[PDB]
Design a protein around this ligand. Structure first.
Ligand code: NAG
Lengths: 50, 213
């Protein structure tokens, strides 16, 4: 209950982060799929492109 | 193009022969059915099996068709005397917006034992000299199989221009005959001392020579 003059260490200071970044790439690769829509002509409804 | 097939397959008369066909995920692996056809060299192809589940009329049960997901397979049991044709894969392609066929597999092993060839050399006649051309023919007859290489020499250097070789055809007595022409001109025909044809069959080489003068 009595403290004299001097230096004293009580606890420690920790800076806890508040946000996290977990993104690995800047962008991913693609595969050719726009040719289904960007095509010269389409198919019919009795025989459609699969 | 999009469908690849092996060039040839080997088998035995009495064992199971199975062919494997591989395409893409948009024509055969997408869910479309496949159809197999036989391309006989000389007659129009006909239907063998459609959908790999139904048997068309006039087709034996010996052919079996299955689709192992992306790849389709055809299996046969025993080799008879009409399988000397080509097998193709036909399926609907969404990317091509139409039907595309396969490559084709040849089904043969060996049917050609050896024989003894004989050649003859005939110089051009007198009426051929005024046509401003010289057709040198060295006929080959009574040989088996029809796989003969043809070489032309003028006793000082081989001739590598105008050399041709015709495909052989079956004779009356199950042999083969062939001919080889050589396009030249009468201007240098008389200058050369002699002309000849040289052929080689299973290591047997025969030579016949003519003299224009
Ligand atoms: C189709 O083409 C247009 C213009 O050429 C383009 O803007 C678009 O990204 C392409 N792909 C699709 C799926 O529309």
């Amino acid at each position: 209950f009595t403290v004299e003059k001097g230096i004293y260490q009580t606890s420690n200071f920790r800076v806890q982060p508040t946000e996290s970044i977990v993104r690995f790439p800047n962008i991913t690769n693609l595969c050719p799929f726009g040719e289904v829509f960007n095509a010269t002509r389409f198919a019919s409804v009795y025989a459609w492109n699969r | 193009s999009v469908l690849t097939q092996p060039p040839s397959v080997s088998g035995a008369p009495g064992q199971r022969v199975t062919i494997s066909c591989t395409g893409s995920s948009s024509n055969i692996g997408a869910g479309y059915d496949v159809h197999w056809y036989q391309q006989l060299p000389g007659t129009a192809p006909k239907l063998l099996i459609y959908g790999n589940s139904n048997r068309p009329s006039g087709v034996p049960d010996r052919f079996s068709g299955s689709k192992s997901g992306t790849s389709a397979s055809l299996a046969i049991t025993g080799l008879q005397a009409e399988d000397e044709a080509d097998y193709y894969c036909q399926s609907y392609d969404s990317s091509l917006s139409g039907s595309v066929f396969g490559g084709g597999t040849k089904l043969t092993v060996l049917g050609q034992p050896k024989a003894a060839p004989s050649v003859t050399l005939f110089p051009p006649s007198s009426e051929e000299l005024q046509a401003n051309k010289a057709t040198l023919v060295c006929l080959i007859s009574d040989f088996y199989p029809g796989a003969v290489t043809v070489a032309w020499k003028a006793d000082s250097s081989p001739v590598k221009a105008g050399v041709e070789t015709t495909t052989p055809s079956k004779q009356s007595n199950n042999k083969y005959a062939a001919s080889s022409y050589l396009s030249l001109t009468p201007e240098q025909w008389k200058s050369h001392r002699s002309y000849s044809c040289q052929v080689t069959h299973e290591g047997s080489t025969v030579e016949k020579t003519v003299a224009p003068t």
